[PDB]
Amino acid sequence: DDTSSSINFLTRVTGIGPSAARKLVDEGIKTLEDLRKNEDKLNHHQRIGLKYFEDFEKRIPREEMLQMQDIVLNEVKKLDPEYIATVCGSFRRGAESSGDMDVLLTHPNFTSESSKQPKLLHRVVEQLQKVRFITDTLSKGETKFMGVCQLPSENEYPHRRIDIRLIPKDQYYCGVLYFTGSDIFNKNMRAHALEKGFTINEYTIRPLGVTGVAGEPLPVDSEQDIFDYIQWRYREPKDRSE
Ligand SMILES: [Mn+2]
Numbered sequence: 447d448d449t450s451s452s453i454n455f456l457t458r459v460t461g462i463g464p465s466a467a468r469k470l471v472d473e474g475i476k477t478l479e480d481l482r483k484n485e486d487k488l489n490h491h492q493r494i495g496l497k498y499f500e501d502f503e504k505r506i507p508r509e510e511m512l513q514m515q516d517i518v519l520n521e522v523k524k525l526d527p528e529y530i531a532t533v534c535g536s537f538r539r540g541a542e543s544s545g546d547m548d549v550l551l552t553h554p555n556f557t558s559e560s561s562k563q564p565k566l567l568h569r570v571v572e573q574l575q576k577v578r579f580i581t582d583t584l585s586k587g588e589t590k591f592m593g594v595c596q597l598p599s600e601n602e603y604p605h606r607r608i609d610i611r612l613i614p615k616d617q618y619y620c621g622v623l624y625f626t627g628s629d630i631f632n633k634n635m636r637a638h639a640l641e642k643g644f645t646i647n648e649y650t651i652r653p654l655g656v657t658g659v660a661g662e663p664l665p666v667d668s669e670q671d672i673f674d675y676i677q678w679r680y681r682e683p684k685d686r687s688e
Pocket residue numbers: 546547548609
């Protein structure tokens with residue numbers, strides 16, 4: 447009812463999951479002013495979401511993402527040019543506006559065999575924070591970081607969501623592909639690959655076999671190699687709507 451209407455509002459909060467939104471109702475937390483008066487019931491994540499609830503509802507204009515991406519890129523280069531960093535999402539596809547910035551990141555040092563190099567990501571984050579670009583963190587794993595950022599005012603920008611992922615270099619490409627979408631796109635493509643006897647995922651492309659349950663990741667060094675294995679002309683991201 448007008449109360450279910452309540453849980454619906456909660457979940458609008460980044461961090462607030464249903465079961466998590468639910469209990470807060472059983473606590474008599476419904477509107478938002480409720481929540482502000484009740485930070486203590488919330489985790490760091492949720493607190494942040496709450497913190498930026500408004501802004502988080504606003505969309506990112508690509509004139510904005512552009513500058514974002516430049517900042518992110520120039521910072522990572524200065525730390526180690528051997529760093530690969532690509533802003534994926536519809537944004538990559540040319541989208542006129544975006545919801546959040548999401549950066550895929552890699553390094554040759556780091557590969558699907560290593561698997562343990564937090565410092566790799568961390569250093570970036572830190573450099574970003576030092577920059578005053580990242581501004582808060584919702585969470586922050588060895589391999590992933592979700593947070594907030596903001597362009598630099600000279601006089602102000604909204605705070606945006608940002609995600610940074612660390613992928614082993616031998617998996618990066620697929621991943622870039624993958625986070626590039628669109629979803630149909632991925633779908634049609636894995637579909638195709640399959641015709642051609644190949645199985646793709648966000649991590650790797652693999653040849654199938656008899657009975658079907660098969661594989662063993664082919665080497666990828668670019669998105670192109672993906673398309674090449676499946677012998678499909680290469681689609682630049684803009685041409686990826688489907
Ligand atoms: Mn995202």
